[PDB]
Amino acid sequence: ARKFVVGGNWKMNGDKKQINEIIGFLKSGPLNQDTEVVVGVPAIYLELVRTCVPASIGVAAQNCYKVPKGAFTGEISPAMIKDVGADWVILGHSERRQIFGESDELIAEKVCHALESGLKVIACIGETLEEREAGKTEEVVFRQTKAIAAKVNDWSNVVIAYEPVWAIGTGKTATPQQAQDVHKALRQWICENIDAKVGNSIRIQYGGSVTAANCKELASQPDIDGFLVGGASLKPEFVDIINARQ
Amino acid sequence: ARKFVVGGNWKMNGDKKQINEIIGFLKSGPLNQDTEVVVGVPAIYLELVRTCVPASIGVAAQNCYKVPKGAFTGEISPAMIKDVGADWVILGHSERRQIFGESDELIAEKVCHALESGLKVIACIGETLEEREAGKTEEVVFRQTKAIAAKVNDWSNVVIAYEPVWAIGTGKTATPQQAQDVHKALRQWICENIDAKVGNSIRIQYGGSVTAANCKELASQPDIDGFLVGGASLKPEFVDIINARQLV
């Protein structure tokens, strides 16, 4: 079976104090034994967080570049991430794709390099509202996935996160069924386009609004293997989400 | 006068081993006391460098965003930079403008926010070869500078670094005179469009190729107040650059 994976993407939030609070939640709160937990933190705190968090819990960078080193002011590489002990990296997040304009190709190259460098990756994909309403959900997620797949040969250390970007500003989030529909269509695409074994073993996290109230129904969907939590990851509620399967 | 300022931009380079070797260069190397020294490091080692580097040397982040916190995965804020004790941030570097497409206005907003957050800033500007050949050197640097000026009211903690981006892949770098021609023109623009005192006191670093072989002649230029160093900042050579203005 696919191990349930819950990632906490802190985004651009945090400081020493706040981090001690958040790590207090993980250490404290009861954690499900069958849940792989990953925490995505700002680069400035990667080493600190990696030292204060149990070896069982993954620590992820929120981004990285495609080469070990180079004339790329403001970027960090997988080698640096590994240098401080971090073992995960979040790539292709919608905020980076849209606000910072990273392309499918760049994301693909980044995923490839991260994996080859020894990092576990959470690659994000997702369609916007205009894309969905234009009935291009599948077209969009298949294109983003296809780009990554073009540079990835081994998916064992990859976790895909689906971000229902279209829901933002909508007034209502995606329904558990809508989320499920996307996950199953994506898994199907992976089975037919990459490999049936990969499709059956790859974890696909739901990357929309996950809270204590909806995490359980969301977690019970056949093709949802976890979450890439946003705001909730900063609160104790993150523990409740980690135990959505309970 | 304007205090000589030398910044070392490591860019995307470094690890614990390499950082200890570079901090070694800085610690042993006889550093001129009249030079303000700053070192720009990858965010991952921001706190690490600040704890190992002497309080006299400034530790800069290589970039930051324009708000204290938010839904900006992969970005860091001045609030975080300060939380680990760093006091500087390099913004608007040519690689971020050209490779990552940061706009003149985003740069200005970041500079404004960084300054307001209590950080000192090395704001970068510079024209490409296309722009220079098309005769837009002044047009570009003034435009980039003007955008930042629209969001800055206090220039005390700002250091401008001019990057002769046009010199890459050309075979030869900018000559000291060519560098001086831009620096002077920018200073003049600042005195006219911002303020006389600001223009006269604002440090303008040369962010082109700076080595131990060309630092002295460059630092001799009337309007060059230091350097934003690239490659050489990862080697002992950085010290010689820092001591570009020492007679012996």
Side-chain angles (χ1 to χ4, degrees):
Chain A
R2 298 188 290 273
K3 190 167 186 182
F4 198 59
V5 212
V6 177
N9 176 12
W10 296 4
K11 294 183 176 181
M12 186 174 80
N13 293 279
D15 55 45
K16 291 172 173 296
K17 177 180 179 181
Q18 172 161 46
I19 285 182
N20 271 178
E21 281 177 43
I22 297 175
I23 307 313
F25 300 155
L26 286 305
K27 284 183 174 294
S28 169
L31 295 183
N32 181 300
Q33 267 288 300
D34 300 297
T35 297
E36 170 168 35
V37 184
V38 181
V39 57
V41 314
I44 296 183
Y45 304 116
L46 278 170
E47 173 150 57
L48 177 62
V49 169
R50 172 70 287 182
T51 62
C52 294
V53 173
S56 59
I57 298 182
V59 177
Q62 285 175 19
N63 188 47
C64 71
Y65 202 50
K66 57 182 189 179
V67 289
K69 59 179 182 181
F72 300 108
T73 305
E75 299 292 304
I76 55 173
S77 58
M80 291 177 193
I81 298 166
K82 297 220 67 174
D83 188 62
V84 287
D87 53 325
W88 287 80
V89 65
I90 295 179
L91 298 175
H93 191 278
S94 74
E95 273 141 33
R96 295 230 62 84
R97 287 178 182 269
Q98 303 174 62
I99 298 183
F100 301 99
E102 294 184 22
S103 64
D104 298 338
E105 295 56 52
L106 174 57
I107 297 302
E109 301 185 299
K110 284 180 174 191
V111 173
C112 175
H113 185 231
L115 293 165
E116 302 195 310
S117 296
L119 288 178
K120 290 178 179 170
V121 175
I122 285 181
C124 309
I125 59 179
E127 90 276 28
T128 64
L129 180 55
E130 305 211 319
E131 299 179 328
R132 191 187 183 79
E133 297 179 303
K136 293 184 179 183
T137 298
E138 305 195 67
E139 182 188 308
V140 164
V141 295
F142 294 168
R143 164 168 54 66
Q144 307 173 321
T145 299
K146 184 180 182 179
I148 294 176
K151 311 321 180 78
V152 177
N153 56 309
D154 183 4
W155 301 76
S156 63
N157 283 150
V158 177
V159 171
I160 296 183
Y162 172 64
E163 292 182 276
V165 177
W166 53 274
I168 310 302
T170 261
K172 61 162 57 183
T173 63
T175 64
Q177 187 55 64
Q178 292 179 302
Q180 167 57 35
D181 291 350
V182 174
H183 281 56
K184 185 178 181 57
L186 181 66
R187 196 183 297 295
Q188 191 175 307
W189 185 92
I190 294 180
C191 287
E192 294 170 53
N193 291 275
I194 299 172
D195 168 55
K197 297 186 71 175
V198 166
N200 299 314
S201 58
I202 191 167
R203 279 79 68 71
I204 305 175
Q205 304 169 313
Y206 172 60
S209 173
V210 185
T211 66
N214 69 14
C215 68
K216 277 173 160 49
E217 199 182 323
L218 235 26
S220 73
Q221 298 304 305
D223 299 89
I224 292 179
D225 304 294
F227 313 107
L228 180 56
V229 184
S233 65
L234 304 177
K235 308 195 303 172
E237 158 181 44
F238 184 56
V239 170
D240 291 312
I241 296 169
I242 288 177
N243 301 322
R245 282 292 181 65
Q246 306 190 320
Chain B
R2 299 182 288 273
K3 183 171 185 179
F4 195 59
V5 198
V6 176
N9 184 14
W10 297 2
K11 300 194 179 177
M12 188 171 84
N13 287 279
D15 58 30
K16 291 177 168 298
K17 179 175 183 177
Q18 174 170 34
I19 291 174
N20 236 266
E21 305 181 306
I22 295 169
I23 300 303
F25 297 161
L26 282 55
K27 275 190 176 298
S28 83
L31 303 190
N32 167 283
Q33 295 201 301
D34 296 306
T35 299
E36 172 153 38
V37 181
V38 182
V39 54
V41 310
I44 271 191
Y45 310 105
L46 240 205
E47 179 151 63
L48 182 57
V49 171
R50 180 66 282 175
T51 67
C52 295
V53 173
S56 53
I57 294 175
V59 181
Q62 286 177 24
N63 181 44
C64 69
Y65 203 50
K66 57 176 184 177
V67 288
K69 56 182 177 170
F72 304 101
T73 303
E75 304 296 305
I76 57 169
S77 63
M80 305 183 168
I81 297 176
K82 304 224 67 179
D83 186 59
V84 288
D87 50 321
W88 290 82
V89 64
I90 301 174
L91 294 173
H93 193 273
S94 67
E95 284 152 18
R96 299 224 60 77
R97 291 175 181 274
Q98 294 175 57
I99 303 176
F100 300 93
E102 299 200 6
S103 71
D104 298 337
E105 178 171 51
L106 174 59
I107 298 306
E109 297 178 302
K110 291 180 173 183
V111 170
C112 174
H113 179 61
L115 292 175
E116 297 184 308
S117 301
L119 291 178
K120 298 177 181 184
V121 181
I122 293 184
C124 309
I125 60 175
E127 86 278 43
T128 60
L129 179 59
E130 315 304 311
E131 301 172 316
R132 190 182 180 79
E133 291 195 308
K136 301 179 176 186
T137 292
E138 308 207 329
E139 179 190 310
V140 178
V141 295
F142 295 162
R143 162 164 57 61
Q144 302 172 317
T145 302
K146 182 174 184 181
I148 294 167
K151 302 296 173 54
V152 176
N153 58 306
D154 188 349
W155 294 80
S156 59
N157 294 134
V158 178
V159 171
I160 299 180
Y162 166 71
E163 294 179 82
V165 181
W166 51 269
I168 304 305
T170 197
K172 71 170 64 186
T173 71
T175 70
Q177 187 60 58
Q178 293 185 300
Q180 170 57 34
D181 291 327
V182 172
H183 277 56
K184 184 170 178 51
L186 189 72
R187 192 176 302 286
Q188 183 185 300
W189 185 86
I190 296 174
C191 289
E192 276 147 40
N193 296 275
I194 293 178
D195 158 51
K197 288 193 62 183
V198 175
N200 289 314
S201 61
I202 182 87
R203 286 84 66 76
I204 304 183
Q205 305 179 302
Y206 170 65
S209 180
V210 193
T211 76
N214 72 12
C215 58
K216 296 193 69 62
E217 170 159 31
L218 272 46
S220 297
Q221 297 316 311
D223 294 87
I224 294 181
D225 302 312
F227 312 108
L228 170 47
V229 188
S233 69
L234 309 169
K235 294 177 294 182
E237 160 176 36
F238 191 47
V239 180
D240 285 298
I241 291 173
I242 292 178
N243 301 326
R245 279 187 178 183
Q246 281 191 174
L247 307 190
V248 183

